[PDB]
Amino acid sequence: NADRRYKWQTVVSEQLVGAGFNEILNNSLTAGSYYEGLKSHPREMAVELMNPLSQELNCMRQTLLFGGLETLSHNLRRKHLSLYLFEWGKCYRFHAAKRTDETPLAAYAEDDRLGIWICGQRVHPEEPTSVFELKAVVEQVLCRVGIETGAYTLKTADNDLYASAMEVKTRSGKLLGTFGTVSTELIKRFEIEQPVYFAELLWDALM
Amino acid sequence: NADRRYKWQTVVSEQLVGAGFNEILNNSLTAGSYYEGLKSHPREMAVELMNPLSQELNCMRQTLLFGGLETLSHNLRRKHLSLYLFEWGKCYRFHAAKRETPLAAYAEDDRLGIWICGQRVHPEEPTSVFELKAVVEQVLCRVGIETGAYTLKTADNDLYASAMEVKTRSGKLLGTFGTVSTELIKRFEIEQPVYFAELLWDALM
């Protein structure tokens, strides 16, 4: 139910704002090139527009990450020293068909996500941010919806969006999300001269 | 469901692309100033971002209209003569709740937006609201809604200079189409009539 979930959303948003965050909102339209060669979100699983105006800008996003990188790139150019951002938004993919009886792509799928970015200088002298600050806010979001630290563990991930990342996975085996340090190649691509810590939480799993 | 909704959407999209339309996709983030003064989508009904980076771009859209107007204005001023656009997307708002919560209810709904602008697609003849009416009927028919199933009634919707509501025998609103307000197309520096339909996907099926 959209109204009940929205009430929980704003409660989590209140806590992030309290921790110093800004809310952002990015187009679900994105660049196909962002996804070339990824295994975490393959280019071939992208939902493409029909007869788009641009051949470059023609995919729906599979992750919230890149909209965030763009917003970071943009705001780092404008001299923001310290960026703590979050975004609620839907993501989209095709699932590959298991059998070769119809089409290469079977189901279309969408899912709700919370994206969280910390970059630059720590808000409290020369002190940079770290992934530990991100872990701490991630843990507190889980906490705000009644998920205790004993209910899940952090495991090393193999996610090529990241240089290194932990998956948050419940005692029951529900993937809750991922957080870590965005891969070197991806941050260079968006001309970010500095590390970016990103978490992406699966809202359906937290509800 | 999403996969099923998606399957019908593409069916309709094929028909639109077949009649010359490009699919577009705009941010659900929009400018509040677009909504000042409107009765149809009042500014105060907007779902707002919390502590946004911009005091101007801080609202979620209530209609698909303005993102299209942005898109049109962007492509016209780059010498397009003819623009036929459609977009699938959610819209957002608060409304009065059911008389035990003090809070307004958040609502979201899937919509189809259709814009026609410029020279009619193949003599040098302008496009017209009648082209859009035909398209709308052809979309309705594709999802199994015969012309006898609904009527057109004159609308009072300040997004439009003039517009028609599409409504079922029972009174269910299926959508709205018409000619965009003079003041709204001037505000986006479009120098030319824009014909816009907005269909309520949830009501069609």
UniProtKB/Swiss-Prot annotation, chain A:
Q: Where in the cell is it found?
A: Cytoplasm
- What family classification does the UniProt entry report for this protein? Belongs to the phenylalanyl-tRNA synthetase beta subunit family. Type 1 subfamily.
State how it assembles.
Tetramer of two alpha and two beta subunits.
- Name the chain's protein: Phenylalanine--tRNA ligase beta subunit
Organism name:
Porphyromonas gingivalis (strain ATCC BAA-308 / W83)
Organism classification: Bacteria, Pseudomonadati, Bacteroidota, Bacteroidia, Bacteroidales
Q: Which gene encodes it?
A: pheT
From Swiss-Prot, chain B:
Q: This protein's superkingdom? A: Bacteria
Q: Which family does it belong to?
A: Belongs to the phenylalanyl-tRNA synthetase beta subunit family. Type 1 subfamily.
Q: What is this protein called?
A: Phenylalanine--tRNA ligase beta subunit
- Entry's localization field: Cytoplasm
Quaternary structure, per UniProt, is:
Tetramer of two alpha and two beta subunits.
